[PDB]
A paper describes a structure:
HSPB7 is a member of the small Heat-Shock Protein (sHSP) family, and is expressed specifically in heart and skeletal muscle. Though it shares the common architecture of sHSPs (an α-crystallin domain, ACD, flanked by N- and C-terminal regions), HSPB7 is unusual as it has been observed to be oligomerisation incompetent. FLNC interacts with HSPB7, also known as cardiovascular heat-shock protein (cvHSP), via d2417–20. Our work therefore shows, structurally, how HSPB7 acts as a specific molecular chaperone that regulates FLNC dimerisation.
To investigate why none of the HSPB7 constructs dimerise to an appreciable extent, we turned to X-ray crystallography. We undertook crystallisation trials on HSPB7ACD and HSPB7ΔN, but did not obtain any protein crystals. We speculated that this might be due to a solvent-accessible cysteine (C131) leading to non-specific intermolecular interactions during crystallisation, and hence generated the C131S mutant of both constructs. Of these, HSPB7ACDC131S returned good crystals, which diffracted to 2.2 Å resolution; the structure was solved by molecular replacement in the P41212 space group. B The Ig-fold is very similar to that of other sHSP ACDs: it contains six β strands, with a groove between β4 and β8 and an extended “β6 + 7” strand. The monomers within the asymmetric unit contact each other through crystallographic interfaces between neighbouring anti-parallel β4 and β6 + 7 strands that form long chains of monomers in the crystal. The lack of a head-to-head dimer in the crystal form is different to most sHSP ACD structures that have been determined, but is consistent with our native MS data that showed monomers to be the dominant form in solution. A rationale for this might be that the β6 + 7 strand is shorter in HSPB7 compared to that found in the canonical human sHSPs; in particular it is missing charged amino acids at positions 118 and 129 that form inter-monomer salt bridges in HSPB1 and HSPB5. These differences likely act to reduce the strength of a putative anti-parallel interaction of two β6 + 7 strands (as per the canonical metazoan sHSP dimer), with the result that HSPB7 exists primarily as a monomer.
Author numbering: 85 to 160
The structure:
């Protein structure tokens, strides 16, 4: 059975986005860098996947509305 949630990263481009998992912790992060390479705009969304979801199965996609979707499978 599928698990999915959406994160609003509409102010950022795909190349700006990072998805991290640590066990069942998931972080969607986005940054824009200035010319000097410092951070001009930063965003992070930290949440926890349900116990019955497999963290290794997480995939992400940028949806047409500009948000990012996290999809993952549950263990049966």
């Amino acid at each position: 059975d599928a698990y999915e949630f959406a994160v609003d990263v509409r102010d950022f481009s795909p190349e700006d986005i990072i998805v991290t998992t640590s066990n069942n912790h998931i972080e969607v992060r986005a940054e824009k860098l200035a010319a000097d390479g410092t951070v001009m705009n930063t965003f992070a969304h930290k949440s926890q996947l349900p116990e019955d979801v497999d963290p290794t199965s997480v995939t992400s996609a940028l949806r047409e509305d500009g948000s990012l979707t996290i999809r993952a499978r549950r263990h049966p």
